[PDB]
């Protein structure tokens, strides 16, 4: 029988410092009684010593007499991943959604969920089944399997359930739906206003699916439905939305998680501390404040002083309490194992590795051509290769060693490869118009082309250039065609992953056939 303080630490999900337990995360089992820990890139440096981490921080739990904790951790695949030394790439939700196939999302999500919990995490942050029908969405994008209800909800539940097979909780977000969102709730409220016609047929539909089909967890947006809650309160923090249309219309008993709060939508305009309260009134029963220790203790404070202030009834607390010691009863939190794990050690295998550059070849998409395309093997290739060099949880400094100058080059290819800025400096950009004067065969990488001017002016150039012969290939959001009226070959790959840069590689040099369809519209859909 759980103490009051050990009840209210159960609704907590924080972030540290540490590749092992830093004195904060300490701090946070045994004295705060936290029920959860989210992992960042901070905590992931290889296999090995992840799993020793999560290994101890159970111990902690376990030999201070705490509950067994949820481990979490936002490795949704391709674009958006914590950890990629030691373990599979996955392709992540826009590039399956191209691929069109939801039995592979089940494997892709399979082979996340079977490393992951290899490694001591039991839960994921993932799958989004937002539904990208807006293509200025600037926190969505490639992160959504696509633009309809119907391929979303397909894939997605096969996701769910490769998770939760692989012994890992899913949690199913950004409830009722970011996807049509012109802002990002990182940096302000977003609105979607639309009727609640439009939310039943399109928003919600996935999340009904997966909440039919058994999903351990929902995490809430930090987003204004107007249609469903009349009060200037995000979903995070409106008992419309949770207990309403989620507990109520859709009879969902599970898990459910805030959005993390420290995000401007919360922490701005409603402060992390009465956040925190308002998001369990609301209904919600997990709050996630990933990684300022005093914005986790505020949230702990104002949690046990609304309690004791009589704003949270003792029976809300329990209720919650009871869903989040089901779910770690269901995924065997507990459970130990042998350490199978050294450092140096991977978890890649040439099956999954295979498996996955199988997905990728599905995925590559053609959206625009005016006839042959395919690489003069005989004639040298300008590769221009974007790298992220101011980076977001959105979109990370990520650096990848199999771009797709090296597959080309592996292929007996007689490549250049200039890697500039997604924001690419003038000289880059000097530097590359002029290195097409010497090289005619020109394949650009775009990254959000879209949403960097400079980047799309500088393609636009080349485009112009008589003498240029100019493939454009984007790597992440597809929509950069939009911004490029002057190209005449476009492909869509949908992140730059290993997998899908030979996926590329092979479509570019005619070994393999373009199988893609575009997943998400050019222009926003209502
Ligand atoms: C809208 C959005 O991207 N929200 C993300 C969420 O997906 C993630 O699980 C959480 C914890 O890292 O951080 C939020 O910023």
Request: hydrophobic share 45%; with cysteine; aromatic share 4%.
């Amino acid at each position: 029988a759980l103490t009051l303080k050990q009840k209210v630490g159960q609704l907590v999900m924080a972030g540290f410092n540490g590749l092992e337990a830093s004195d904060d995360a300490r701090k946070l089992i045994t004295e705060d009684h936290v029920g959860g820990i989210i992992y960042f890139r901070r905590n992931l440096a290889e296999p090995a010593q992840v799993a020793k981490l999560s290994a101890e921080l159970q111990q902690i739990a376990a030999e201070s007499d705490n509950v067994p904790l949820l481990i979490s951790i936002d490795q949704e695949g391709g674009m958006v991943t914590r950890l990629e030394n030691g373990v599979t790439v996955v392709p992540g939700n826009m590039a399956l959604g191209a691929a069109g196939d939801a039995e592979l999302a089940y494997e892709a999500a399979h082979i996340i969920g079977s490393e992951l919990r290899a490694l001591g995490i039991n839960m994921n942050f993932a799958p989004s089944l937002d539904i990208n029908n807006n293509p200025g969405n600037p926190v969505i994008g490639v992160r959504s399997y696509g633009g309809t209800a119907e391929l979303v909800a397909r894939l997605g539940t096969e996701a769910v359930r490769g998770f939760q097979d692989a012994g890992v909780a899913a949690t199913v977000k950004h409830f009722p739906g970011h996807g049509d969102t012109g802002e990002d709730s990182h940096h302000a409220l977003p609105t979607v206003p639309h009727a609640r016609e439009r939310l039943d047929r399109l928003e919600l539909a996935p999340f009904r699916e997966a909440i039919a089909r058994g999903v351990d967890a929902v995490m809430t947006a930090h987003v204004l439905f107007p249609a469903v809650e009349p009060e200037k309160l995000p979903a995070t923090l409106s008992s419309n939305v949770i207990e309403g249309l989620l507990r109520g219309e859709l009879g969902y008993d599970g898990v459910v998680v805030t959005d993390c709060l420290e995000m401007n939508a919360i922490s701005k305009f409603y402060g992390v501390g009465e956040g925190a309260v308002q998001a369990v009134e609301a209904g919600a029963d997990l709050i996630l404040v990933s990684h300022r220790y005093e914005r986790q203790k505020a949230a702990l404070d104002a949690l046990l002083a609304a309690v004791e202030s009589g704003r949270i009834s003792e029976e809300r607390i329990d209720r919650s309490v009871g869903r989040l010691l089901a779910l770690k009863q269901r995924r065997a939190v507990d459970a130990g194992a042998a350490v199978t794990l050294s450092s140096g050690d991977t978890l890649v295998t040439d099956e999954k590795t295979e498996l996955v550059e199988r997905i990728s070849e599905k995925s590559i998409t053609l959206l625009r051509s005016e006839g042959e395309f395919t690489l003069d093997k005989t004639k040298p290739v300008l590769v221009v290769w974007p790298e992220v060099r101011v980076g977001s949880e959105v979109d990370e400094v990520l650096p990848r060693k199999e771009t797709l100058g090296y597959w080309l080059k592996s292929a007996g290819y007689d490549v250049n490869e200039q890697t500039i800025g997604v924001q690419p400096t003038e000289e880059e950009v000097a530097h590359i118009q002029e290195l097409s004067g010497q090289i005619s065969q020109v394949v650009v990488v775009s990254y959000n082309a879209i949403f960097s001017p400079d980047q799309a002016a500088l393609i636009e150039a080349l485009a112009a250039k008589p003498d240029v012969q100019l493939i454009v290939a984007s790597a992440r959001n597809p929509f950069d065609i939009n911004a490029l009226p002057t190209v005449k070959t476009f492909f869509a790959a949908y992140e730059n992953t290993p997998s899908a840069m030979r996926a590329l590689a092979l479509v570019l040099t005619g070994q393999i056939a373009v199988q893609g369809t575009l997943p998400a519209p050019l222009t926003v859909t209502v």
